[PDB]
Structure formats: structure tokens, C-alpha cells
């Protein structure tokens, strides 16, 4: 049944929760069955979070060889991407919530860490790699659920990765994704210190047929909104900073591609490797795609509003 | 809203002479310029096309006709008040505004047989003031910018044109929007091949 | 010098040019575009001359 | 059947769509718990934009059976919001969805229940056990007036849309398709677009009816839709679209500027792989 997976068998779910397959192989969890609550307030609370980093408890479960994110989202908080084990401090949320969630038959228990790096991700940085590693030696099954809000703004796709980091003693085997990502100066060094200590879960999504019908019917009156983006008007001088950043974003490449140091490699420090040109690459891609946003928005609005027919 | 029933009982109660009164009321009723369904009463049908068929004639003028018609036909129709006459004037103006997004000043200056800007703008502002019209006069263009027009009349049996018409507008949006849509679709298709090849390499790595 | 200006010398008057943002941007844009495209084929053919291993031997 | 036919309130919140799915999910939850379509309650929230309502986000709740009536376990819900208002503070309890037939005195009763946390809350009715083709959301609101010597509240329906969030929209497009990402990108005014899209499909059927149908020949259609369609395609003006193309020039300019930057980027990429394998300097 389509509802066969929405079935939260607290029996079965908490069974595999106490199953501890990870202590036998820390690569058991290959899947991540998610209900779209993750997308829900993960997305709109990374975006509504402005640029303020956040943390806390995810709802969820486990099924077969699968971590399950019933929930993930953001705080109106900060400090994540630099907090010594940030996420913990928001668990008070379902220190209460899940509890009397059981009072409505939400007999689930706490499973994970909601969070958002508004504008630049949802993950655990250098100090939060202390967070991530320590807690997966604290809290396994634990995940680095990773999706970037403004990346998912200028990207059109949810790059979700459930990153069970490779615990200390457990190296990446054959399957360690280790999603390399352009990090600010604060944590790029420690990512290089820990970029290959995590793998991703095969993050699938589960729903009901009512869910599909609701999204279709959503579109069935959102299309009017579609031709009203109305995307250029939103970032009038935004892109200026973007541009003034983007060339500096490009100077990012410059920053890591400027150098006279001949010799054999990077031969002093990680530069490294000719550099940050990939940083400016993602920068140019996102900024020209947001230009695509603005232009398709206003132009297709002209295509429909300004002139269609009588 | 009140006037429709108001006239309804009037047509029921009032004819000819009584009519002269009702007609006097009808002339004076904004929005109640055209009879449509309202004329469906046999009483008014007789009252219309009656001895004072000319009254019905002005009714039609409200439906189809214009103030310039009166300009030609000062005599043909029943007489009106300055208020009513300028009313019909606004009628032609709103009609023209329907035709042109911005009707030039001289358009109505000639159409209404108007002399100049003072009265011209006064009446125009009055028309917009009723909130029938939006925007403002187009000073640069010597026209009238308008967002929308408030429904005054039936204007007699238009069903053919109006019904014909809805889809046309829809078609305009449909065509342009579709073009962008397909371009996106093809783009997504490229996405598929790109992701597809990416997946293929994925397969290769094992 | 600072002359953002014009003179109809037939007129015998100076006429300060307005500093163009838009079309001056267009200017520089397609200028660098043509430069980049010339250099595109140029570096292609340089990769050629280096892969083709051609050097003009003195004798 | 004590309903009261009223007016608006104080709705505006933000939305993400799995909470609509949690409308679905509370119905599924209570149904699996009870083995039956359970007329459930859920914490409606939404957008309020001028005179527009948008009933969007409402998840699982507690709906007790008081002898016939749906019941918001009121202080339970207080517990619940304090269980999420710590971090879900961006959302506020607008109303409650349910599942069943039309709105009934139990729906009226829990809507009143929602009328006790605030003054003028909203009503939503969904049902996967009802039999419509439309998106199953009924939405009610309140006046306070005087009729027949009785001072009473008033609850009646208004229409909605759903959220316009970027990654939210992306997820909607996927979970609808699951292979949108471009299509309805006129979105701030595409509310207007597809709202009046369905509206004017209705209007085509509706003018066919007013021709005839029921409805007789109709002047409402005549004057109103006449001005409407025969101003169309409105906004097709010139200067105006001149500056539209000025838009297009600047935008395509800078976008292809960045794409040129990426072009010479991959150029340098290739050149650096060259330097690795080939450039011996
Ligand atoms: Zn930390």
C-alpha cells in the first residue's frame, strides 16, 4: 500500500532502533526513508532563518537497512557551523513534543538532528565535526543530514545526503561518498581534516497517494503564481553584491590561484591544489541560474500577462 | 442592486405615463442603463418600443449607441438632463476606453463634441471618480490610462462576442507560457541525459 | 585629461559626455567576448602546436 | 448544523507542503489506530494577503470523541504548541483540518475550539473519504453581528492557494513527478495566474452556461467578462515592453557574462589538467 510505509510500527521502528547494526557494520544504514517534514521546515526555516545557523532534534525511525527522517528543520538560532555540539540544545523541542506526540498516537521517539545553515547548508562544520564525530560515537545511528538552503534556492533540486560519518576507528570503505563542498574559511581546513570521514544514505522519500494528489492540486492553482515571479524584482540590487561578491567569488579562484611557488605541488599547504576556481564555479553557476530565475520569471510573465490573447 | 427590483415593480406597476416616471428613474440610474433581462417583463416590452420607443431607443443607445449618436440625433431620442446627457457622454467614453486602452483626449473631444480640457477632464475624472475607471489620464499621450472598468450595463445581447473571446485571451497566455514551458522541458530532458550519463559513469566506477 | 565631453568644433562649444553605464558595459562585454573567443581558438591552436610538436628547426 | 456565515481574521504565516501531507498523515494515523476513516483535527496555519486567504500548514492533532463530537484536546494542544513553539515559532495555530463529509456540528464544535485560543480562527475540511475532484480544503472565518435579536458569530468559506517557497516548490515538483523545476515560474503573480486560470476555465464553461445553461442569457457575463477579455491581452503595450526588452538585454548580458566566466573556467580546468599531464614548465 502507498500508506504501508507511513505506517510507523513503533514496535518495528524502535526494534531496529535498538538493533545496533552499525556496531556490527557502520555501513549498514544505506537508505534514508524520509517523510517530507525534513524538506518542510528544513527548507523554509533555513530560508526563514536568513543566515542564522540552527540545530536540534529530528523525528524519525529505522526500517530494514534504512535511517528514516520523519522530521528535519531549523531553529531561529545561530552558532551552528561553529558550535561545540550545537544540535543538542534544541532537543528540548522533542524533549517535550514527541512525548505528548505519543498522546495522539505519535508513539515515535527522537531520532536525529534538525538544523539549517541558512544560505550555506545544513551540516556540521569543523567544531560541528567535533559535534558530528563525537555524537556518532555518542548517538549512533547519527547522520549528517546535508542540504543547502540557498543552494536549493538557486539549484532547483534537493541535494539530500544522510551522512553517517565514519566513526573514529571506522574509515571510509568502498562506499564513502564524503560530499566535498565549498566551505567558508572558518571550516574548510577542518573539512580537509575530516572530508573523508562520512558516507551518505540512499535517501528515498515515502508518502501517500493523497500526498501526490495534494501536490498536483497545489500546482493546479500555483501556475498563476508561476507566471508572477516574479524573480527579477526580488533581487534588485541583491545581485550587485552577488556580482560584487561573484567576481570576488571569482577572485576566490584568484585567491587560490594567484603564486610563484614552483616546485612540485602544494608543497606547503593544501592549495593546496591550484585552488577555489571550483568555488567561483559554483558561484557563477548559482548566480547565472538566479539570473535565469529572474529573466524566465519576468519574461514568461510578459509571455502570459502582457500578451496572450483577447 | 436595489434598483433592479425597484424598476421591476415599477415596470409591473408603471406604464406609459407611470412609465414616464420610471423611465425618468431609469435614465437617472447608474448601472441601470440597459434592460437585458429587465426588459424581459412584457410590461416594459410594451413600454419599450412604445409611443416613446425613442426611450427604448436611448435604452439601446445605452446598450449599443453612443452620445455622439445624440450629437447627430438631438431630436431622435427623448430629452435628457445635463446630468443624463453627460452620462451618455461618459457612456461613449467608457465604451471607447474599452476599445482603446488609452483614449486620446481629442477622441472624446470630438466624440462627445466637447470643447476643451476643463470640462473634458472634469467629466473624465467624474467618470473615473465613480470608480468605473482606473489609472489616470495619460497626460503625455493625451489619453486615459485605466486598470479596469466597472460594469455599467448589459449593453444588449453580446453573448456571441464575449463567449467567443474568453479562450482567445487564454490562448495568448497559453501559447507564450507553453513556449517557455517546452524550452524548460527540453532543458529538463538535457538534465535527464546529463544525470543519465552521470549515473552511467557511476555504474562504471564499481 | 578629465574630458568626458564633446565639441562640435563647427559649434565651438564643449559638451560633457554622460558616463554610460549600460551600453559602455555592452561595449566592454562584447569586446572581452571577442577577445576571449579569438583567444579560445588561439589556445586551441596553441594546444595544437604543442601537441603537434612543431618547432622551426634553425638549419 | 449551526454555522454562521462570516468574515476574515489574522491568518498570515509561512508554509511547507508535507504538513498538508500531515493532514493526510493524521488521517492515516487515526485511521490505522482505529481501523476507519477518522474525522481528525489538525493545526491549520496559513497566508493572509490583504483580502486573500491561503490555508496551508496543518499537521496531526488530538481529536477525542465526546459522545458524538470531534474534540480538540485543548490543553493538550497547548502542550503540543509549547512542544513545538520553542522552535516552530514561525507558525501559528490558524485552525483545524478534519476528515469526513461536509462540515458538521462536530466540525463546527472543534472550529469553535480553535476559536478559543484566538478570536477569529480558520476552518479547513479535508477528506480522502469524500468524493470530489477538487483539492479537499474547506475554509471558514467569522463576523460578529446581530440577527433576530441574537448577537452571534458568523463562519463562512474563503478560497486559498499554497506556498511559494523555492526548495518547497522544487520538492512539490519532484514528489508530484518524482523522476515544476521551470514551469510556473511567474509565481508571485502566478498566484493570480493559475488562480484565474482555473477561474477562467470555469469562466468559459460559465459563459457557455450564461449563454444557454443554469443560467439564462447573462449581462453579468456580458459587461463584466466583456471588459475583461476585450481589454486582453492586457499589458501587451509597447516603451513598456521596450523596457521589458531592456530588462532582457541586461539580464541576458550578465547571465551570459557569468557563463563566459564558466567557459574560460573550464578552459583553465583543461589547461590545468594539461599542466598536470603535459605542461612541463
Ligand atoms: Zn560543533
Ordered DSSP codes for A68-133 = EES--B--S---TTTSTT-GGGGTHHHHHHHHHHGGGT---EEEE---BBTTTBSS--HHHHHHHH
Residue B144 has phi, psi (to 5 degrees) of -140, 115
The alpha carbon of residue D198 is apart from the nearest alpha carbon of chain B, in Å, by 11
Kindly provide the b/e burial profile for residues D223-262, where b requires at least 16 CB atoms within 10 angstroms of the residue's own CB: bbbbbbbbbbbbbbeeeebeebeebeebbbebbebbebbb
Residue D132 has phi, psi (to 5 degrees) of -110, 165
Residue A232 has phi, psi (to 5 degrees) of -65, -45
Pairing mode, strands B143-144 and D122-125:
unpaired
Q: Is A293 annotated as a binding residue?
A: no
Residue to mutate among B167, B168, B172, with most A CBs inside 10 A, is: B172
Q: Which residues contact A284 (CB under 8 A, 6 or more apart)?
A: A246, A249, A250, D258, D259, D261, D262, D265
Q: Are B106 and B99 in contact (CB under 8 A)?
A: no
**Neighboring chain A residues of B168 at a CB cutoff of 8 Å:** 309-310
In the PDB record, what is the listed experimental method? Answer: cryo-EM
CA distance linking residue D206 with residue D215, whole number of Å: 9
The residue behind cell 566566466 is D261
Range list of β-strands (E), chain A: 31-34, 58-63, 66-69, 109-112, 144-146, 161-165, 198-201
Tell me the sheet residues that pair with B144.
B137
- Is residue B23 helix, strand or coil? helix
The alpha carbon of residue B13 is apart from the nearest alpha carbon of chain D, in Å, by 24
Residue to mutate among A206, A217, A228, with most D CBs inside 10 A, is: A228
Q: Which of B166, B183, B192 sits opposite D204 (nearest CB)?
A: B166
Q: Are B123 and B115 in contact (CB under 8 A)?
A: no
Q: Of A125, A171, A170, A168, nearest to A148 (Cα)?
A: A125
- Is residue B165 helix, strand or coil? coil
CA distance linking residue D18 with residue A39, whole number of Å: 8
State in Å: Cα B54 to ligand 1 middle.
Answer: 89
Task: Please tell me which chains touch D, using 3 or more CB pairs under 8 Å as the contact test.
Answer: A, B, C
The alpha carbon of residue B107 is apart from the nearest alpha carbon of chain D, in Å, by 18
Handedness of CA D272, D273, D274, D275 (dihedral sign): positive
State in Å: Cα D32 to ligand 1 middle.
Answer: 40
Q: Of B99, B178, B112, B176, nearest to B144 (Cα)?
A: B99
Pairing mode, strands A58-63 and A109-112:
antiparallel
| Breakpoints of chain D, after residues (C–N > 2.5 Å) | 179, 211, 214, 238
The residue behind cell 532563518 is A49
Q: Are A172 and A197 in contact (CB under 8 A)?
A: yes
Q: Of C44, C54, C51, nearest to D270 (Cα)?
A: C44
Chain D from 197 to 236: CB within 8 A of any A CB:
197-198, 229-230, 232-236
CA distance linking residue D12 with residue D54, whole number of Å: 8
Nearest CA in chain D to A159: D167
Q: Which of B168, B170, B177 sits opposite A303 (nearest CB)?
A: B177
Check CB contact of D243 with chain C, cutoff 8 Å.
no
Residue B129 has phi, psi (to 5 degrees) of -65, -30
Pairing mode, strands B143-144 and B137-138:
antiparallel
CA distance linking residue D183 with residue D173, whole number of Å: 10
Nearest CA in chain B to A156: B188
Q: To one decimal place, what's the resolution in Å?
A: 8.4
Q: Give the CA count within 13 Å in the CB-facing half-sphere of A71.
A: 28
Q: Is A115 annotated as a binding residue?
A: yes
Q: Which residues contact B58 (CB under 8 A, 6 or more apart)?
A: B27, B65, B77, B78, B80, B88
Q: Give the CA count within 13 Å in the CB-facing half-sphere of D48.
A: 17
How distant, in Å, are the alpha carbons of A104, B77, B129, B146 from that of B87?
66, 14, 13, 19
CB atoms within 10 A of CB D143: 15
CA distance linking residue A164 with residue A18, whole number of Å: 17
Torsion angle defined by CA atoms of residues C19, C22, C25 and C27, in that order, rounded to the nearest 10 degrees: -90
The range of the structural domain enclosing residue A81 comes to 1-206
How distant, in Å, are the alpha carbons of B27, C29, C39, D263 from that of C34?
71, 9, 8, 13
CA distance linking residue B65 with residue B78, whole number of Å: 14
Check CB contact of B202 with chain A, cutoff 8 Å.
no
CA distance linking residue A44 with residue D179, whole number of Å: 23
Check CB contact of B205 with chain A, cutoff 8 Å.
no
The residue behind cell 550555506 is A120
The alpha carbon of residue D133 is apart from the nearest alpha carbon of chain C, in Å, by 52
**Neighboring chain D residues of A122 at a CB cutoff of 8 Å:** none
Q: Give the CA count within 13 Å in the CB-facing half-sphere of A118.
A: 19
CA distance linking residue A7 with residue A14, whole number of Å: 13
Residue A7 has phi, psi (to 5 degrees) of -60, 110
Q: Is A18 exposed, middle or buried (0-12, 13-18, 19+ CB in 10 A)?
A: exposed
DSSP chain D: -----------B----THHHHHHHHHHHHHHHHHTS-----EEEEEEEETTEEEEEE--B--EEEETTEEEE-HHHHHHHHHHHTTT-TT----EEE-BSSS--HHHHHHHHHHTTTSSS-EEEEB-SSS--SS---EEEEEEEEEETTEEEEEEEE--------HHHHHHHHHHHH----STT--HHHHHHHHHHHHHHHHHHHHHHHH------S-HIIIIIIHHHHHH-STT----HHHHHHHHHHHHHHHHHHHHHHHHHHHHHHHHHHHHHHT---
Pairing mode, strands A66-69 and A31-34:
parallel
CA distance linking residue A127 with residue A124, whole number of Å: 8
CA distance linking residue D107 with residue D113, whole number of Å: 9
CB atoms within 10 A of CB D26: 29
State in Å: Cα B182 to ligand 1 middle.
Answer: 46
Q: Which three cell numbers stand for residue D91?
A: 507558525
**Neighboring chain C residues of D274 at a CB cutoff of 8 Å:** 47
Check CB contact of D277 with chain C, cutoff 8 Å.
no
CA distance linking residue D243 with residue D79, whole number of Å: 55
Q: Which of C33, C43, C47 sits opposite D260 (nearest CB)?
A: C33
**Neighboring chain D residues of C30 at a CB cutoff of 8 Å:** none
Check CB contact of D267 with chain A, cutoff 8 Å.
no
How distant, in Å, are the alpha carbons of A20, A22, A40, A164, D200 from that of A27?
11, 6, 27, 8, 55
Q: Of A285, A241, A225, A84, nearest to D164 (Cα)?
A: A225
Cis (ω within 30 of 0) for the bond into A309? no
Q: Are A108 and A98 in contact (CB under 8 A)?
A: yes
Q: Which three cell numbers stand for residue A268?
A: 606547503
Pairing mode, strands C6-8 and C13-15:
antiparallel
**Neighboring chain D residues of C25 at a CB cutoff of 8 Å:** 253
Inter-chain CB proximity D274 and C43 less than 8 Å:
no
How distant, in Å, are the alpha carbons of B16, B62, B158 from that of D222?
29, 14, 6
The residue behind cell 438632463 is B81
Q: Which residues contact A6 (CB under 8 A, 6 or more apart)?
A: A35, A206, A207, A208, D25, D28
State how far Cα A130 lies from the chain centre.
18
Amino acid at each position: 500500500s502507498i500508506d504501508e510505509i507511513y505506517k510507523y510500527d513503533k514496535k518495528q521502528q524502535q526494534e531496529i532502533l535498538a538493533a545496533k547494526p552499525w556496531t556490527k557494520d557502520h555501513h549498514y544504514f544505506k537508505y534514508c526513508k524520509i517523510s517530507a517534514l525534513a524538506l518542510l521546515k528544513m527548507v523554509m526555516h533555513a530560508r526563514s532563518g536568513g543566515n542564522l545557523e540552527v540545530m536540534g532534534l529530528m523525528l524519525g525511525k529505522v526500517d530494514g537497512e534504512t535511517m528514516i527522517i520523519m522530521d528535519s528543520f531549523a531553529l531561529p538560532v545561530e552558532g551552528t557551523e561553529t558550535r561545540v555540539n550545537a544540535q543538542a540544545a534544541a532537543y528540548e523541542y522533542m524533549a517535550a513534543y514527541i512525548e505528548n506526540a505519543k498522546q495522539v498516537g505519535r508513539l515515535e521517539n527522537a531520532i536525529g538532528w534538525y538544523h539549517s545553515h541558512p544560505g550555506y547548508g545544513c551540516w556540521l562544520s569543523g567544531i560541528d565535526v567535533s559535534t558530528q564525530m563525537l555524537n556518532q560515537q555518542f548517538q549512533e545511528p547519527f547522520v549528517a543530514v546535508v542540504i543547502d538552503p540557498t543552494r536549493t534556492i538557486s539549484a532547483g533540486k534537493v541535494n539530500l545526503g544522510a551522512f553517517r560519518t565514519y566513526p573514529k576507528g571506522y574509515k571510509p570503505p568502498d562506499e564513502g561518498p564524503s560530499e566535498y563542498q565549498t566551505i567558508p574559511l572558518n571550516k574548510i581546513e577542518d573539512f580537509g581534516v575530516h572530508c573523508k570521514q562520512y558516507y551518505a544514505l540512499e535517501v528515498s522519500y515515502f508518502k501517500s497517494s493523497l500526498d501526490r494528489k495534494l501536490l498536483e492540486l497545489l500546482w493546479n492553482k500555483y501556475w498563476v503564481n508561476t507566471l508572477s515571479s516574479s524573480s527579477l524584482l526580488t533581487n534588485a540590487d541583491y545581485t550587485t553584491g552577488q556580482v560584487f561578491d561573484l567576481s570576488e567569488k571569482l577572485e576566490q579562484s584568484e585567491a587560490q590561484l594567484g603564486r610563484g611557488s614552483f616546485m612540485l605541488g602544494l608543497e606547503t599547504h593544501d592549495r593546496k591544489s591550484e585552488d577555489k576556481l571550483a568555488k567561483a564555479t559554483r558561484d557563477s553557476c548559482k548566480t547565472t541560474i538566479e539570473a535565469i530565475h529572474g529573466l524566465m520569471s519576468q519574461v514568461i510573465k510578459d509571455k502570459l500577462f502582457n500578451q496572450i490573447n483577447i | 442592486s436595489n434598483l433592479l427590483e425597484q424598476f421591476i415593480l415599477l415596470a409591473k406597476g408603471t406604464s406609459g405615463s407611470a412609465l414616464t416616471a420610471l423611465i425618468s428613474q431609469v435614465l437617472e440610474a447608474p448601472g441601470v442603463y440597459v434592460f437585458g433581462e429587465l426588459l424581459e417583463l412584457a410590461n416594459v416590452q410594451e413600454l419599450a418600443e412604445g409611443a416613446n420607443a425613442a426611450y427604448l431607443q436611448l435604452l439601446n443607445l445605452f446598450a449599443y449607441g453612443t452620445y455622439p449618436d445624440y450629437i447627430a440625433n438631438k431630436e431622435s431620442l427623448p430629452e435628457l438632463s445635463t446630468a443624463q446627457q453627460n452620462k451618455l457622454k461618459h457612456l461613449t467614453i467608457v465604451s471607447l476606453a474599452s476599445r482603446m486602452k488609452c483614449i486620446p483626449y481629442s477622441v472624446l473631444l470630438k466624440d462627445l463634441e466637447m470643447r476643451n480640457l476643463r470640462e473634458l477632464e472634469d467629466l473624465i475624472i467624474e467618470a473615473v471618480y465613480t470608480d468605473i475607471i482606473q489609472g489616470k489620464l495619460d497626460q503625455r499621450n493625451q489619453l486615459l490610462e485605466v486598470d479596469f472598468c466597472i460594469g455599467r450595463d448589459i449593453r444588449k445581447k453580446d453573448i456571441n462576442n464575449i463567449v467567443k473571446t474568453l479562450h482567445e485571451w487564454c490562448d495568448g497566455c497559453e501559447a507564450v507560457l507553453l513556449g517557455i514551458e517546452q524550452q524548460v522541458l527540453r532543458a529538463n530532458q538535457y538534465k535527464e541525459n546529463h544525470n543519465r550519463t552521470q549515473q552511467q559513469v557511476e555504474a562504471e566506477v564499481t | 585629461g578629465l574630458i568626458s565631453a564633446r565639441v562640435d568644433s563647427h559649434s565651438k562649444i564643449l559638451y560633457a559626455r554622460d558616463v554610460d553605464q549600460r551600453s559602455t558595459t555592452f561595449e566592454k562585454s562584447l569586446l572581452m567576448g571577442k577577445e576571449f573567443q579569438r583567444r579560445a581558438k588561439a589556445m586551441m591552436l596553441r594546444a595544437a602546436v604543442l601537441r603537434n610538436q612543431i618547432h622551426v628547426k634553425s638549419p | 448544523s449551526v454555522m454562521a456565515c462570516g468574515v476574515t481574521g489574522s491568518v498570515s504565516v509561512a508554509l511547507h507542503p508535507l504538513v498538508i501531507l500531515n493532514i493526510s498523515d493524521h488521517w492515516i494515523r487515526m485511521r490505522s489506530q482505529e481501523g476507519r476513516p477518522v474525522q481528525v483535527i489538525g493545526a491549520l496555519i496559513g497566508k493572509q494577503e490583504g483580502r486573500n486567504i491561503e490555508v496551508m500548514n496543518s499537521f496531526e492533532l488530538l481529536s477525542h470523541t465526546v459522545e458524538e463530537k470531534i474534540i480538540i484536546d485543548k490543553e493538550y494542544y497547548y502542550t503540543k504548541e509549547e512542544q513545538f513553539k520553542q522552535v516552530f515559532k514561525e507558525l501559528e495555530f490558524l485552525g483545524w483540518y478534519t476528515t469526513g463529509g461536509p462540515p458538521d456540528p462536530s466540525d463546527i464544535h472543534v472550529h469553535k475550539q480553535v476559536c478559543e485560543i484566538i478570536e477569529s480562527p480558520l476552518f479547513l475540511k479535508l477528506n480522502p473519504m469524500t468524493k470530489h475532484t477538487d483539492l479537499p480544503v474547506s475554509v471558514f472565518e467569522s463576523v460578529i453581528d446581530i440577527i433576530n435579536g441574537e448577537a452571534t458569530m458568523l463562519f463562512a468559506e474563503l478560497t486559498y492557494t499554497l506556498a511559494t517557497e523555492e526548495a518547497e516548490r522544487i520538492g512539490v515538483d519532484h514528489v508530484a513527478r518524482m523522476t515544476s523545476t521551470v514551469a510556473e515560474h511567474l509565481i508571485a503573480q502566478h498566484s493570480a495566474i493559475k488562480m484565474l486560470h482555473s477561474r477562467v476555465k470555469l469562466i468559459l464553461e460559465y459563459v457557455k452556461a450564461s449563454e444557454a445553461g443554469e443560467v439564462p442569457f447573462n449581462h453579468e457575463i456580458l459587461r463584466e467578462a466583456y471588459a475583461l477579455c476585450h481589454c486582453l491581452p492586457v499589458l501587451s503595450t509597447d516603451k513598456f515592453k521596450t523596457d521589458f526588452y531592456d530588462q532582457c538585454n541586461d539580464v541576458g548580458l550578465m547571465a551570459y557574462l557569468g557563463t563566459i566566466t564558466k567557459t574560460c573556467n573550464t578552459m583553465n580546468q583543461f589547461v590545468n589538467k594539461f599542466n598536470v599531464l603535459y605542461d612541463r614548465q
